[PDB]
């Protein structure tokens, strides 16, 4: 007794309503956005890359890295559903399973431990936990992981900033602001290292 | 086979809703704004040019450099469609192609390779790659190219500032901030060389 067609449409329209929530919480969008935010503030440029471009890059990146799970949903939950092979209730479960598996690969056991105790449910295996518990654990792990990557990328720009300030202080020109002179070198290092292609490749490879 | 009048209208309104995205992700708007962002940051003025006029000049600059491609879209796609020479499906493809060609002229081979492997698809010719994968490669190349131009624009202003600081220190006045003295000199040398006209030539002509 699968859900009637009227209820099936009502469920799907509700999922489209929560589409921003699914992208910003259940996907890779948050980690990429935060790492780009740290990198932008690491250099002297405040909002030169602009917010729309940063989100635009992240949206394409989060679509590419989640193409495997997106295809797995299609090949196991959409095509059998359209071919009249699985109950609509079964198809919904078949779509949710790869999404849960992907979120578990990028989560930390400490995050699961605190939220499982917070929910107060007696579950032992770290695979049959509810989405209500998994999603906050996943987004917490993504924020912490983004900070680690953000600190990693920040260090070389801190090195340049300290060197420029030290060299200027060596000549006794303490009045000269190190930030104005430091910025072209920060652009210099990031461009001869091929930073933009490098960071997006690492962010793509990070989700594994 | 061809889309009905009702459906064609729906597609037209949809592209108008996404019009800001097409400007800042497919056209030359991103490179111009980033380069102009460096120019404002290089000089001692922080918000003095203000954000409004920079975007407005960038929009007019884009319409100038996109005029060949926009006219090519007009001739190849709009004119047969208005005269009812071709169907809506092929007219849409005839409009998409000039945009794809322009994005290929402003991208790099390495950037395309990274994203085509990232998408996990099969292709052998760059000319028939999907626009969904071309867009992230296009802007990534645009950001790297803009940083290169901005770095070159930042050097002469760094040159002027370092000279003024050295002169003041050499004269013995270790108490005066170089920024106040250097700012008129940076502005004077920006005007008597007609700096913006030179930047227009190296920015508008950089696409070709």
């Amino acid at each position: 007794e699968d859900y009637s067609v009227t209820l099936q449409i009502l469920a799907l329209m509700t999922m489209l309503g929560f589409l921003p929530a699914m992208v910003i919480l259940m996907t890779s969008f948050t980690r990429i956005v935060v790492v780009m935010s740290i990198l932008r503030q690491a250099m002297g440029l405040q909002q030169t890359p602009s917010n729309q471009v940063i989100i635009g890059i992240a949206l394409f990146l989060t679509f590419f890295v989640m193409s495997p799970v997106l295809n797995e949903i299609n090949d196991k939950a959409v095509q059998p559903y359209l071919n009249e092979q699985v109950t609509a209730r079964e198809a919904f479960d078949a779509a949710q399973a790869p999404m849960k598996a992907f979120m578990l690969k990028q989560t930390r056991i400490k995050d699961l431990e605190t939220f499982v105790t917070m929910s107060g449910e007696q579950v032992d295996n770290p695979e049959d936990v509810s989405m209500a518990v998994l999603i906050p654990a996943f987004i917490t792990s993504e924020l912490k992981t983004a900070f680690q990557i953000g600190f990693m990328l920040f260090l070389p720009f801190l090195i340049i900033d300290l060197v420029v300030a030290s060299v200027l202080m060596a000549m006794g020109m303490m009045m000269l602001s190190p930030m104005i002179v430091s910025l072209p070198f920060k652009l210099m290092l990031f461009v001869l290292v091929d930073g933009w292609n490098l960071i997006l490749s690492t962010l793509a490879g990070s989700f594994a | 086979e061809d889309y009905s009048v009702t459906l064609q209208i729906l597609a037209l309104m949809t592209m108008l809703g996404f019009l800001p995205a097409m400007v800042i992700l497919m056209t030359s708007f991103t490179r111009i704004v980033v380069v102009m962002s460096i120019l404002r940051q290089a000089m001692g003025l922080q918000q003095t040019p203000s954000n409004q006029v920079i975007i407005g000049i960038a929009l007019f600059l884009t319409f100038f450099v996109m005029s060949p491609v926009l006219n090519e879209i007009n001739d190849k796609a709009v004119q047969p469609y208005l005269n009812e020479q071709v169907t809506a499906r092929e007219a849409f493809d005839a409009a998409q192609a000039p945009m794809k060609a322009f994005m290929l002229k402003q991208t790099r081979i390495k950037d395309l390779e990274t994203f085509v492997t990232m998408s996990g698809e099969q292709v052998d010719n760059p000319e028939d790659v999907s626009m969904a994968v071309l867009i992230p490669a296009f802007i990534t190349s645009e950001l790297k190219t803009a940083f290169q131009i901005g770095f070159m624009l930042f050097l002469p202003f760094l040159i002027i500032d370092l000279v003024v600081a050295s002169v003041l220190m050499a004269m013995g006045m270790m108490m005066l901030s170089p920024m106040i003295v250097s700012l008129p000199f940076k502005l004077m040398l920006f005007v008597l060389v007609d700096g913006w006209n030179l930047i227009l030539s190296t920015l508008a002509g950089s696409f070709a």
Partner: peptide, 21 residues
Amino acid sequence: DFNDLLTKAINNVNTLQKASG
């Protein structure tokens, strides 16, 4: 695949409109 999902949906709507007209 998933990309063709949107293409198929639009074609069905176009076919339904074409038959209705």
